[PDB]
């Protein structure tokens, strides 16, 4: 079956231009049955239409191009039909433009229509490419303790907040791997600052707090940094 494959940079600095290419296989971008374009999805959020186009003209134009009205001022779409390529260019990006970008083929009332073609749904999707918009440089984390109270029915939650690092990933262990039961390390969030943060938590017996040391071991290989942060009761 046909396939759509996105390519292009996956890290773009704020205020710069985000450009992607989609290579279409198994269908013809010159044909008049579909529109070709893009949908995007910020991590953890919903789908947002970007736009689409066709080079199949009526007698009063040279084709059709439809844009999300909120993106129009920054957006340029194109086709190179001999090469079967679709293009996206989005100027002046900010944190709000971090997203998985999907190449998309649209169907609807396209081949035959009244007044204008109506590409209404996406009947073929690319695998998507996550483009991060951040002007950050590589930077090791700032690690802060999430201290338990000395006194949840006999258990104590404690953790570490791993702030403001770039790029991903960090990994976290506890007590150099001697503590694994009840550990959870959360997914990172990319903040509007363009830096990542995450936390790791472990639940332990409250009776242990006076006798057992708890240390979170944070590793950030991109900056060649390790931080061992002692987490003490308040």
């Amino acid at each position: 079956q046909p396939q759509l494959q996105e390519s292009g940079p996956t890290l773009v600095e704020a205020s710069e231009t985000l450009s992607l290419t989609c290579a279409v296989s198994g269908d013809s971008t010159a044909a008049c049955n579909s529109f070709w374009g893009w949908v995007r999805q910020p991590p953890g959020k919903g789908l947002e239409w970007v736009g689409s186009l066709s080079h199949c003209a009526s007698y009063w134009n040279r084709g059709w191009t439809y844009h999300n009205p909120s993106l129009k001022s920054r957006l340029t779409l194109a086709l190179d039909t001999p090469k079967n390529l679709v293009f996206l260019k989005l100027n002046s990006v900010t944190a709000a433009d971090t997203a998985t970008y999907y190449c998309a083929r649209f169907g609807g009332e396209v081949l035959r229509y009244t007044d204008w073609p109506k590409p209404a749904w996406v009947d073929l999707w690319g695998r998507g490419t996550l483009v991060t918009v951040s002007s950050a440089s590589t930077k090791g984390p700032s690690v802060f303790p999430l201290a338990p109270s000395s006194k949840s029915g006999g258990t104590a939650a404690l953790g570490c907040l791993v702030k403001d690092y770039f790029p991903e990933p960090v990994t976290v262990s506890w007590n150099s791997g001697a503590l694994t039961s009840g550990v959870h390390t959360f997914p990172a969030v990319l903040q509007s600052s363009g830096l990542y943060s995450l936390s790791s938590v472990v639940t332990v017996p409250s009776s242990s707090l006076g006798t057992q040391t708890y240390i979170c071991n944070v590793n950030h290989k991109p900056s060649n940094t390790k931080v061992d942060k002692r987490v003490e009761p308040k």
Binding site: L47, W49, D123, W125, G126, L146, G159, L161, F186, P187
Partner: protein, 205 residues
């Protein structure tokens, strides 16, 4: 706009219907999106299935509400489902998505731990409240923050629920404050809603 419930659930073998309000024409579609994957079209033109989409999926419409029904839920039907529509002359819009859980264990209410800013972070002239949510199922929650009794929306980041080692779910939410605003209120609260009921924790400077 198109409005969908944030989540839904049913057991294997059962039928379930999820809705999308605000549809104004027959240019209605539905998409299935598995975790970490691209969406896939499962219904177009209200009730048509692309080749290969199982006949257990069906679409309908009543007034301005479109619905997707899955008849005989299977574990691999667990996904986020989006509705889409043409609107205006030629625009495309999507609903916000419904996370459909196929129930494979008992429902379980969340535990919540709220950490105030650490002394070390405060000494670095910053402040983050950290709300850690654990041991819940299905893996769908909403988080709301309050300063004293008033809602706070600015400075909030919340993760998508993540599976724990014990196969229940966890999530995290962060409220970023200045040390000044942290000290200017008598308390802050993190309220977690799960299956229509809440658990709320409060901390005081």
């Amino acid at each position: 706009a198109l409005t969908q419930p944030p989540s839904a659930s049913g057991s294997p073998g059962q039928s379930i219907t999820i809705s999308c309000t605000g549809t104004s024409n027959n240019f209605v579609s539905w998409y299935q999106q598995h975790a970490g994957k691209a969406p896939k079209l499962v219904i177009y033109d209200v009730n048509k299935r692309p080749s290969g989409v199982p006949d257990r999926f069906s679409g309908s419409k009543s007034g301005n509400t479109a619905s997707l029904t899955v008849s005989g839920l299977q574990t691999d039907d667990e996904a986020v489902y989006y509705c889409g529509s043409l609107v205006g002359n030629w625009d495309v819009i999507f609903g916000g998505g419904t996370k459909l859980t196929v129930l494979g264990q008992p429902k379980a209410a969340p535990s919540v731990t709220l950490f105030p800013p650490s002394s070390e972070e405060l000494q670095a002239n910053k402040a983050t409240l950290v709300c850690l949510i654990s041991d819940f199922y299905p893996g769908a929650v909403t988080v709301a923050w309050k300063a004293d009794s008033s809602p706070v929306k600015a400075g909030v980041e919340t993760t998508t629920p993540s599976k724990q080692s014990n196969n229940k779910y966890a999530a995290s939410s962060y409220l970023s404050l200045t040390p000044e605003q942290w000290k200017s209120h008598r308390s802050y609260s993190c309220q977690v809603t799960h299956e229509g009921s809440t658990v709320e924790k409060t901390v005081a400077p």
